Design a protein around this ligand. Sequence first.
Ligand SMILES: Cc1cc(=O)[nH]c(SCC(=O)c2cccc3ccccc23)n1
Ligand code: NA
Ligand code: NA
Length: 293
Amino acid sequence: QLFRALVSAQWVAEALKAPRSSQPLKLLDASWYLPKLGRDARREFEERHIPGAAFFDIDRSSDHTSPYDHMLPNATHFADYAGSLGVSAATHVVIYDGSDQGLYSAPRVWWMFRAFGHHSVSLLDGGFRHWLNQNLPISSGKSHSEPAEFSAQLDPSFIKTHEDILENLDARRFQVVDARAAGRFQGTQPEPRDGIEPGHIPGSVNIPFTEFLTNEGLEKSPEEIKRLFKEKKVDLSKPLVATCGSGVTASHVVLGAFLSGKSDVPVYDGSWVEWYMRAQPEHIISEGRGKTQ
Ligand SMILES: Cc1cc(=O)[nH]c(SCC(=O)c2cccc3ccccc23)n1
Ligand code: NA
Ligand code: NA
């Protein structure tokens, strides 16, 4: 009783050859990379992308009035932007990116469409990496589309707030799962944002987003995902909230839970950037020694 979250490269290639008029397919490249990788997602799209794809820029689908990173825009802003990419309520949106990991930032966009009330959305398992590995056809050129009518409404159950995370330190009403790399979580490797130092939220559990994916960047099976959660002491029959640096890679936790039957995993959108900025010293658990310490 959920719309499929994953489609395969083979499924996509077939759809490109057999298009479905009543349910049009819109392919979106949502690649986004941290600056230190020295990659230009938009330019890469211009060079190669899945045929007929548009480029979904997650910096044009964020609230720039926030001091935090990658915050959900309001619904009017999202709808304007999704309609400008040619997405209507009839559309089966399929999102990918070109990350080394397979999928990286695309899960965030799958989550956002759902959050804003568009449930016919999936992700291309293995992303562009796998598409290229299969020697499937590619196109070049800047992104474009005719505009379409799109409406959005945010369901707030998709989000948790700082206030919620804070209340939960004592209340322990939900399990917080943090998708950052282990060393950022532990406090021994740097955070990408200048002025943010690493560490973790007290009581949270680290499941780096890479552990949801196979060695070659395909999704693990639901059998293996359930095993992962359980080995990390996360109980899927209890509430679960996903978090990371800025709320982007958190969406792999959300996806993994969705594929294992649990559809209601909210994202703490403010994530570690917000948490660190709004913290008292008791709120920052780290093996690293602060400037103050
Ligand atoms: C997506 C992501 C993944 C991740 O592992 N961590 C973060 S923290 C936000 C951030 O570094 C950041 C976000 C936006 C722009 C920036 C510009 C400079 C440096 C850091 C960031 N974000
Ligand atoms: Na965010
Ligand atoms: Na930093």
